[PDB]
Design a protein around this ligand. Structure first.
Ligand code: ADP
Ligand code: ADP
Ligand code: WJ1
Ligand code: WJ1
Ligand code: K
Ligand code: K
Ligand code: MG
Ligand code: MG
Lengths: 309, 309
């Protein structure tokens, strides 16, 4: 069952033939998708494309294409096993790509007149990248025998559990900077369990939690020891999963509202949290919507489609 | 200070000359706006325009134009006083217009192929009507000496007070039908007071409250004696007033979501509550936005711009 035009193999065999079919799928799929990313770099405005960090990333993708296309057609388990080593190397080599693009683009984008251009390039590049890393990680995970997982697909994911995971994480970060962190309540369908892919949530949830906690602390500088809770509601229905994250952090100002979804815009991280999360949600067939109550707080609505039966 | 291109006179004199200037303004303004509504009827699809209820309303507007244009130019207080009698008559004669349009259009709109057509006609007709009734009522109110009012403009409106007014009202209606009504909590800027025109709120608030209470009751048929509260948050900033109305009434279904803002669409009133409220909010420079958590509830966000300094 599929992410967009990308299928995650739920097949399984004892002879391990599902691993060869998966491996062969990747082998046919990855080079084409990397070619697309390279075409993306080739079409960047010249002046942005000449930035040395952008050039570095452009070269990384070329190298990846080279390694992928030089790898021989998979015929046996020894082949597949070796291909996995390559996939692991590329996953690691490219792990800082978002950060590098942010850096390379930060100034150089100001050099051009179409602001739509960079946004489009980042949405496209980052979401294609997520899709590639999902397929790749899924293949590697097929070798695992974690219970409740078929690759990266959790067969019985609890939204509440994964939210709490990221809450603990964001609270620790927040405490480190402010001395305290809002407490988080979670309500709604807290007992929901369903088949789901965690990975997008692992990107998005911490970004939105960090935003909500930061806003809460910075609007309560006089009582850091007593700040309004962040409240999270889970709604699980047959079509989608909805996670609403509500804070009393004072809201997103009218003057900032039309900018918060721009890559690089920050009123402080490096301003990628919101546009990246939205691009990811929409890529997967969901959405990310903001409701600002200026003077009071912000509600953020994450919607992700369910895995189709 | 103004609604769109319509100015509400805050002028005041002891000789009562502000009343003559206001009266003269109305006299120049109303006939033109009524002419526009008549042109709206003239352009309706023939088959809809021939509906007898639609024809009735079309005639009402013609009569109104006739009476308005036959009235002599205002020169003195006796004139103005008489013009007020006319305005009062028209206000009353036209008080059921929304209901009549709903009825006349209900079936006849199915006869045509552009669904955008009726929506546009209603948005335009209903909002122009609100604007006219606001100007008209404002003029009449200039004769009043209610404290805290300049015409229909409240100089120190409390959002909490007007919300409670409509809560009591909606709860009574709801209790009459279900035996109980959700309790309502109000939070946020509960002590806010500012200059504001109540009239749009008096339309919108009861519509949204009725929706929220109905949804809550119909999703709790087994425990009507114990239903989730409706929760209302007031956010007051320098740009707008935001009133969020949140229920745990189960949400607006995915299959219904794209229809709830259509005139006439109802899953039960007569399906005008939402599209009418949105048209009114947008006419006044605000908005009405819905966030559905299918399986849990709905958040409705009403935003109205503040009176400009
Ligand atoms: N929940 C929130 N409350 C208030 N402001 C927010 C919230 N979420 C985001 N923002 C604003 O949006 C801006 C952009 O957020 P983001 O894309 O995550 O980048 P960053 O957090 O690195 O600035 C933030 O700088 C902040 O001003
Ligand atoms: N808060 C809500 N919760 C659930 N459903 C709602 C809510 N508000 C509106 N709806 C749905 O939207 C439809 C249209 O609402 P409206 O325009 O007010 O007309 P009516 O209430 O007369 O049907 C309703 O019939 C109902 O199905
Ligand atoms: O940019 C990335 O992170 C990805 Cl596209 C690199 C990669 C390519 C192919 C296979 C696995 C990882
Ligand atoms: O349809 C209405 O309610 C309004 Cl437009 C009728 C009216 C016209 C002119 C003055 C006052 C009321
Ligand atoms: K941003
Ligand atoms: K409707
Ligand atoms: Mg952030
Ligand atoms: Mg209604």
């Amino acid at each position: 069952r599929l992410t967009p035009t990308m299928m995650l193999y739920s097949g399984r065999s004892q002879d391990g033939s599902h691993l060869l079919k998966s491996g062969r799928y990747l082998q046919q799929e990855l080079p084409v998708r990397i070619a697309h990313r390279i075409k993306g770099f080739r079409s960047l405005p010249f002046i942005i494309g000449c930035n040395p960090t952008i050039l570095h990333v452009h070269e990384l993708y070329i190298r990846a294409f080279q390694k992928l296309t030089d790898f021989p057609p998979i015929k046996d388990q020894a082949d597949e096993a070796q291909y996995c080593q390559l996939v692991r190397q590329l996953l690691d080599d490219h792990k800082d790509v978002v950060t590098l693009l942010a850096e390379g683009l930060r100034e150089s984008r100001k050099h051009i007149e179409d602001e739509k251009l960079v946004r489009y390039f980042l949405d496209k590049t980052l979401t294609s990248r997520l899709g590639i890393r999902m397929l790749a990680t899924h293949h590697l995970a097929l070798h695992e025998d974690k219970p409740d997982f078929v690759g990266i697909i959790c067969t019985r994911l609890s939204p509440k559990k994964i939210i709490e995971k990221w809450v603990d994480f964001a609270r620790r970060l927040c405490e480190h900077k402010y001395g305290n962190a809002p407490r988080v309540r979670i309500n709604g369908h807290v007992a929901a369990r369903f088949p789901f892919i965690p990975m997008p949530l692992d990107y998005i949830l911490p970004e939105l939690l960090k935003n909500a906690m930061r806003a809460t602390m910075e609007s309560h500088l006089d009582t850091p020891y007593n700040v309004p809770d962040v409240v999270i509601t889970i709604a699980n229905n047959d079509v989608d999963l909805i996670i609403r994250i509500s804070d009393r952090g004072g809201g997103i100002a009218h003057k900032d509202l039309d900018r918060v979804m721009d890559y690089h815009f920050t009123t402080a991280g490096f301003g990628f949290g919101l546009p990246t999360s939205r691009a990811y949600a929409e890529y997967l067939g969901g959405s990310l919507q903001l409701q600002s109550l200026q003077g009071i707080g912000t509600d953020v609505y994450l919607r992700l489609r369910h895995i189709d039966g």
